[PDB]
Amino acid sequence: ASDSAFWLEVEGNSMTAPTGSKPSFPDGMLILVDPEQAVEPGDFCIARLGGDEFTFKKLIRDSGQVFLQPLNPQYPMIPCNESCSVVGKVIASQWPEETFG
Amino acid sequence: ASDSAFWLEVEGNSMTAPTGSKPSFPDGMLILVDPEQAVEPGDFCIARLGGDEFTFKKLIRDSGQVFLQPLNPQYPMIPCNESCSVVGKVIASQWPEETFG
Amino acid sequence: ASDSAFWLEVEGNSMTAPTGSKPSFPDGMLILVDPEQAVEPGDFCIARLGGDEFTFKKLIRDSGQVFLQPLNPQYPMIPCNESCSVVGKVIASQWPEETFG
Amino acid sequence: ASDSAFWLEVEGNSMTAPTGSKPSFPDGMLILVDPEQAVEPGDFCIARLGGDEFTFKKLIRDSGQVFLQPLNPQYPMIPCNESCSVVGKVIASQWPEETFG
Amino acid sequence: ASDSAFWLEVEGNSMTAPTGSKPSFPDGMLILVDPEQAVEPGDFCIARLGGDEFTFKKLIRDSGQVFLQPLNPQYPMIPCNESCSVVGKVIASQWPEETFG
Amino acid sequence: ASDSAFWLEVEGNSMTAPTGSKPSFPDGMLILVDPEQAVEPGDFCIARLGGDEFTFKKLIRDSGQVFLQPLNPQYPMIPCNESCSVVGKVIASQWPEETFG
Amino acid sequence: ASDSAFWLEVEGNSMTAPTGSKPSFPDGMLILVDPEQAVEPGDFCIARLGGDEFTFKKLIRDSGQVFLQPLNPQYPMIPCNESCSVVGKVIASQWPEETFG
Amino acid sequence: ASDSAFWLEVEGNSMTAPTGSKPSFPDGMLILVDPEQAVEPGDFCIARLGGDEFTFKKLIRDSGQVFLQPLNPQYPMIPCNESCSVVGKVIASQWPEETFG
Structure with missing residues (x-):
């Protein structure tokens, strides 16, 4: 974990996988982002989209296109192009x- | 966090909560059981059962009787009695x- | 695979995993049910309910009780006891x- | 199947059909690829694209144009022209x- | 089709299957309901719920229980118990x- | 309808509309084509490209030009001119x- | 339109219908919310969900269950219960x- | 807003931009055309095309040339010369x- 790495709190159900599926990061959990570790296809990450909303998705690649995929299927998958910057890997x-009290 | 405390891998959906509520412990997660800490009502704990098979649940009390309650509504509740014995509090x-690869 | 093993066509969505999660046996697939192999917990199987109901679920163990679990969340879990006899292990x-044409 | 046919393991969600539709090839499944058999419209195949990266899709034809179409609605469809080359038929x-362990 | 059959205009995405799966009854279509024909598991129907309101879904049976299942994944399945009654088979x-104006 | 009208089973997802859109003609349905009725813009029809295989789209007019339009947004729009011949209106x-069983 | 009625700017793509569907409200448009007009199933409202955050969606009901549905099939349909409160009708x-310049 | 200005109902996808990009005028929207105002490059306008057929597009200037540019990349560009006349500005x-109900 680089010096740069920082913590974030999962806020949303976009990354909450269906029951019996894994991994899963329910709203509430903490995730350690490390700007210094590259994000490869299959890796989880934080990315800043248009405007200023950061997102926590699994970065995948299909047919030459790169998408930010959610673990919750009921949510949208989105192309990651111009206004899509990967801020760091979720380690x-x-x-x-x-x-736990 | 005691020295008798150890790690266990959650294996099942019993502690997987309905999307939205929290917390939630999905199959594949790591929980830290600390025998040297008591399981107050509402705490999460491991419990050795008859044939000596652990069980991951929330300890609840209802009239001098103690129950092991799963966060997954689908999984039934269980009374902690003769063969039931807490093995530690999940911390x-x-x-x-x-x-994370 | 014993000389008694037999193929069956999956008919239904009780064993259809949520997009992203494995295994999964969508309606249409074939499955080899071997009556001669023991069904350990975590194993997929064909059980009979009542006496004529053929069911295809994952046999599991929670808090000392055995359940026939569906890979499809929307489907209810069911306790396996008296009127629940395991027919064979899916292999x-x-x-x-x-x-494929 | 020709002696040139090999098995690949599906890695992704692109070929995972929505519940109810079939067939479906969820991540984790094995697909037999025969480079010697031809891919007719409607068949399932593996095809080499731009940077030579393989892709598992359905070959379809519409309005006299060829496309590599995924069984999973969320994934985009791709025109199979110049930099699109078919590796083999999935069989x-x-x-x-x-x-099944 | 009996003398009691009547047509209903599908209102809602409850029975709209995802792209590639059939059949599908998108909002806007017409369905001929026949109160005189029995609804077997598998059939499509109109059932009246406890609220006393009508619902359009596919009736299924699993592990001995009966449910009214939608064709659109986003919609929940529901047990067809006491407050659930079949109005007629969709034919x-x-x-x-x-x-087509 | 004329005596020249015949039935065609829709095959393909070109005319399948996004959930919550109408009309929609999912692969599987039956469309009645009647060669004797003029296909006005906004009408559904069967057309011939290259004088051979059928294309089931929606004839439209934009900026003076005519196109055969797919109800599925994924499918590309295609200019109807020379090699484009309308076979009949979908009625x-x-x-x-x-x-329905 | 009552006095309480106020304007909001649509922000996001949850209500951007697929090309060729209507209505649709691309991120950027304004919407008049009138807290004083009830919201019947089928109406477009502004609801306040758990996190004290507001959502713009179409209220619907299925099998006696209210849902906040988006015009964009990509996004999820959320059940509107306990923590869900309808603030006003979008008019x-x-x-x-x-x-416009 | 002049006395000559009038409302028109957009019919088509010509002016339906890709999700995310704005503005976007989905089929079904009302646009107000003011014949008295001038259509500077970049503005949205209406145009009479030959035999009296309207067109809704954006007025661009490429190579000292006045075209009619659609917001939907799928729709072809058109030059506004002889048989093309502006009819006013979309205000x-x-x-x-x-x-809304």
């Missing part, structure tokens, strides 16, 4: 300790 | 690092 | 050849 | 025997 | 003739 | 009766 | 004048 | 009241 995820 | 949970 | 599955 | 598909 | 569908 | 569509 | 939508 | 667009 870890754990529930915050409060979660 | 942490994270995805194995292999998860 | 292979493939699409029927016609599937 | 079999099954889960690896590990699937 | 034909077509676009109104205005569709 | 009715329905699911074959087998569809 | 108008127009682009801002700046739009 | 406002909005959805018909009937759209």
Whole structure:
């Protein structure tokens, strides 16, 4: 984990996989982003889209096109082109300790 | 966090909550069981059962009786009695690092 | 595979995993049910309910109880006991050849 | 199947059909690819695209134009012209025997 | 088709199957409901729910339970128990003739 | 309808519309083509490209030019000119009766 | 349009219908919300969900269950229960004048 | 907004931009054309084409040439010379009241 790496809190159900599926990062979890580790296809990541919303998706590649895919199928998959910048690789995820009291 | 504390890999959907509610411990996650800590009502814990098979659940109390309750509505509740014995309180949970490649 | 093993065509969506998750046996696939192989937990199988109902689920164990689980979340889980006899272990599955012209 | 046919393992969601539609080739399945058999419109194939990257899709024809179409609605469709080259016809598909342990 | 049969205009995406799966009854189509024909598992129907409101879905049976299942994945399946009653079997569908003006 | 009208089973997803759009003619349905009725813009029809294979689209006029339009946005629009010959207007569509058990 | 009625700017693509569908409200358009007009199934409303955040969607109901549905089939259809509160009916939508030079 | 200006109902996808890009005038919208105003390059206008057939497009200037550019990349570009005359400027667009209920 580089010095640059920072923590973020999963906010949304976009990355919450269907029951029985894995991995899954339910809204509430923490994810460690590390701007210094490249993001390869199949890796999870944070990416800044148009305007300023960062997103947490699985970066995939199909037919030469790169998409940011959600673990929740009920959500949209999106092309990652011009206004799509990968900020860093998600290298870890754990529930915050409060979660256990 | 005690020294008798150990890691276990969640294997099942019993602790997988309906999308939206939290927390949620999906099959494949890592939980840290600490025997040297008590399981107060509402805490998450491991419990050795008859044939000595662990069970991941939430300890709840209802009239001098103690129950092991799954976060997955589909999974039935279970009364903790003769062969039932808490093995420790779950204090942490994270995805194995292999998860992030 | 015993000389008693037999093929069956999956008919239904009880074993159809959510896009992204495996395995999955969509309606249309074939499955080899071997009556002579024991069904350990975590194994896919063909069980009979009542006496004439053929069911295709994943046999599991939660909190000391055995359940026939569907790979399709929307479908209810079911406890396997008295009127629930395992018919055989699913040991292979493939699409029927016609599937390809 | 020709002696030049090999097995590939599906990696992705592009060929995963929505519940109800068939066939479907979810990530993790094995597909037999025969480079000696030709791919007629409607067949399932592997094709080499731009940077020579392989892609598993359905070859279709519409309005006298050829397309590589995914079984999964979320994925885009691609015109199979110049930099599109067919590697082989998909002729079999099954889960690896590990699937049933 | 009995003398009691009547047509209903499909209102809603409940029975719209995803692209590539058939059949599909998109919002706008016509369905001939016949109250005098029994609805076997597999058939499409109109059932009246506890609310006392009408619903259009596919009736299925799994592990002994009966459900009214939609063709659109985004919609929930529902057990057809007490407050669930079959109004009639859906036996034909077509676009109104205005569709082609 | 004229005596020149015949039935055609829609084959392909060119005329399948996005969920929540109408009309829509999913692969599987039956469209009634009547060669004797003029195909006005906004009408559905069967056309011939290169004087051979049929294309089932929606004739339209934009900026003085004519195009055969697919109800599926993924499919490209195609200019109807020289090698483009309209075979007849689509006047009715329905699911074959087998569809309903 | 009551006094309470206020204007919001559509932000996002949850209500951008697929090319060739209607209505549709691309990110950028304005929408008049009137808290004083009820919202019947089929209406376009503004709801406030859990996180104290607002959503613009079409209220619908299926099998006696209310859902907030998006015009974009990509996005998810969410059940509107406990934490879901309908704030107002959307009764108008127009682009801002700046739009047109 | 002049006395000569009038409302028109957009009919077509010619002016339906790709999701994300704005503006976008989906088939079904109302656009207000003001004959009295001039259509500077970049503005949206109406145009009489030959035998009196309207066209909704954007007025661009490429190579000292005045074309009619569509917002839908799928639709061909058209030059506005002889048999092409502007009919006014699009100064406002909005959805018909009937759209909301």
